[PDB]
Design a protein around this ligand. Structure first.
Ligand SMILES: CS(=O)(=O)N1CCC[C@H](C(=O)Nc2ccc(Cl)c(F)c2)C1
Ligand SMILES: *[C@@H]1O[C@H](CO)[C@@H](O)[C@H](O)[C@H]1NC(C)=O
Ligand SMILES: *[C@@H]1O[C@H](CO)[C@@H](O)[C@H](O)[C@H]1NC(C)=O
Ligand SMILES: *[C@@H]1O[C@H](CO)[C@@H](O)[C@H](O)[C@H]1NC(C)=O
Ligand SMILES: *[C@@H]1O[C@H](CO)[C@@H](O)[C@H](O)[C@H]1NC(C)=O
Ligand SMILES: *[C@@H]1O[C@H](CO)[C@@H](O)[C@H](O)[C@H]1NC(C)=O
Ligand SMILES: *[C@@H]1O[C@H](CO)[C@@H](O)[C@H](O)[C@H]1NC(C)=O
Ligand SMILES: *[C@@H]1O[C@H](CO)[C@@H](O)[C@H](O)[C@H]1NC(C)=O
Ligand SMILES: *[C@@H]1O[C@H](CO)[C@@H](O)[C@H](O)[C@H]1NC(C)=O
Ligand SMILES: *[C@@H]1O[C@H](CO)[C@@H](O)[C@H](O)[C@H]1NC(C)=O
Ligand SMILES: *[C@@H]1O[C@H](CO)[C@@H](O)[C@H](O)[C@H]1NC(C)=O
Length: 337
């Protein structure tokens, strides 16, 4: 009694209308207040098919996050091509907030509750919703932060495991904490990670990929070329862009179960993930910067040519932030009634 049809969604959130936080301020006038009585109703004995890769819900989320960042973050010198802008860049307050996506009249969001759903194929436990759930728009590379965990075992999401061009999204079932600090060289910082927890999870991820890869041996080597943005766990902490060398995490060696410390730097000059170009920001806040986050997902790529070798090699990746969003909109699909 329905049909697949992509249209314009709208958004909702608990954005505090008094907070100056840029996500709050932008959500105070680009989104409607939250659904007071959310009503998730189940669809008895139904089966509909999902494809988290050919989902237009991301393409819409992408545009919003682009708008949020374009309105909010103030660079001292925005640059493009055949143009150079030189505005101001004061001290802000950054901290993502959950925003809910919603469907207008005549349409509805279908949700996939199969716990072991890989993102693609038929879904047996389908329930409809008027809006999604709170989704923090967190921008990052290699690791996915402050995300939603799985409800069973690790999941391997890829549009096509056969193609090495396609990225691999590893959905963890156990969040691993990351703790990054710049104490009172002002651009030097470090991230602390529990080696024990991590190596175990990584060992779990190893066997999970063996299953999908004919028991071949796997190796986690570091990135193979690219910009500093892509070869470093790039993210944002309280406004300041952090660049973290994850070489310790991606090794096949792991007395290596204490506290893994990763060296980081706060960069003022970055390569925008919108593609636009490069941008420069002010020094950091006069004090002690600190963010504690949950490692939820992992973003990997695989090298080709190994159809006659024994083992398989994966490197942490990213770049396209659509995968960051698609890591949250995988279970949703928009249908018109
Ligand atoms: C055009 S691009 O998509 O190939 N590519 C260009 C180079 C780097 C870009 C990027 O990832 N920037 C980026 C910036 C800030 C943060 Cl906090 C982050 F996590 C990432 C992506
Ligand atoms: C369907 O999903 C719901 C919500 O996640 C959960 O209670 C359970 O996994 C399933 N319930 C039934 C009756 O199949
Ligand atoms: C996901 O499940 C479908 C079956 O519904 C299967 O064809 C596909 O290969 C699976 N993909 C991965 C990455 O496991
Ligand atoms: C981190 O994960 C724990 C459970 O694993 C959860 O209770 C907590 O809210 C998460 N924190 C964030 C910031 O997502
Ligand atoms: C996570 O998944 C692995 C297999 O992928 C499983 O062995 C493990 O028990 C799971 N852990 C949790 C906390 O669900
Ligand atoms: C997966 O990728 C391979 C290699 O690029 C390609 O030849 C094949 O057609 C793809 N398979 C599917 C099912 O899309
Ligand atoms: C994070 O690390 C800082 C310094 O490395 C430490 O003072 C703080 O207690 C840590 N916080 C958590 C939640 O682990
Ligand atoms: C690592 O996690 C274990 C539990 O798996 C916990 O007992 C310990 O405090 C953690 N150690 C570090 C160094 O984070
Ligand atoms: C992988 O090896 C296990 C035994 O270690 C075997 O039971 C299973 O059939 C193999 N699977 C694949 C896909 O090769
Ligand atoms: C990360 O550190 C390792 C040594 O710990 C070094 O070999 C590597 O070049 C560093 N990564 C980058 C992107 O410079
Ligand atoms: C993740 O959430 C925690 C708690 O809400 C926050 O302290 C931290 O800054 C967040 N990390 C990122 C990268 O947004």
């Amino acid at each position: 009694v329905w049909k697949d049809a992509d249209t314009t969604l709208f958004c909702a959130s608990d954005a505090k209308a008094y907070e100056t936080e840029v996500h709050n301020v932008w959500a105070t006038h680009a989104c409607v207040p939250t659904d007071p009585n959310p009503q998730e109703i189940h669809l008895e004995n139904v089966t509909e098919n999902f494809n988290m890769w050919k989902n237009n819900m991301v393409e819409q989320m992408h545009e919003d996050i682009i708008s949020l960042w374009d309105q909010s973050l103030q660079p001292c010198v925005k640059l493009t091509g055949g143009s150079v802008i030189k505005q101001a860049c004061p001290k802000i307050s950054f901290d993502p907030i959950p925003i809910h996506y919603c469907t207008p009249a005549g349409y509805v969001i279908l949700k996939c509750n199969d716990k072991n759903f890989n993102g693609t194929g038929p879904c047996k436990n389908v329930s409809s919703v008027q809006c999604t759930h709170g989704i923090k728009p967190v921008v990052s590379t290699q690791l996915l932060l402050n995300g939603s965990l799985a409800e069973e075992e690790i999941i391997i999401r890829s549009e096509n495991l056969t193609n090495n061009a396609k990225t691999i999204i590893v959905h963890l079932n156990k969040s691993v904490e990351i703790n990054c600090t710049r104490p009172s060289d002002i651009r030097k910082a470090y991230c602390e990670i529990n080696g024990t927890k991590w190596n175990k999870v990584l060992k779990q991820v190893t066997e999970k990929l063996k299953e999908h890869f004919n028991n071949k041996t796997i190796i986690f080597q570091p990135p193979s070329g690219g910009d500093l943005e892509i070869t470093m766990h790039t993210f944002n902490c309280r406004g300041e862009f952090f660049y973290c060398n994850t070489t310790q995490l991606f090794n096949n060696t792991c007395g290596c179960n204490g506290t893994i410390t990763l060296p980081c730097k706060i960069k003022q000059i970055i390569n925008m993930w919108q593609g636009t170009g490069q941008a420069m920001y002010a020094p950091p806040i006069d004090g002690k910067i600190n963010c504690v986050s949950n490692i939820t997902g992992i973003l990997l790529t695989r090298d080709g040519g190994a159809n006659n070798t024994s083992n398989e090699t994966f490197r942490p990746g990213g770049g396209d932030m659509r995968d960051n969003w698609r890591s949250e909109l995988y279970k949703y699909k928009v249908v018109q009634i």
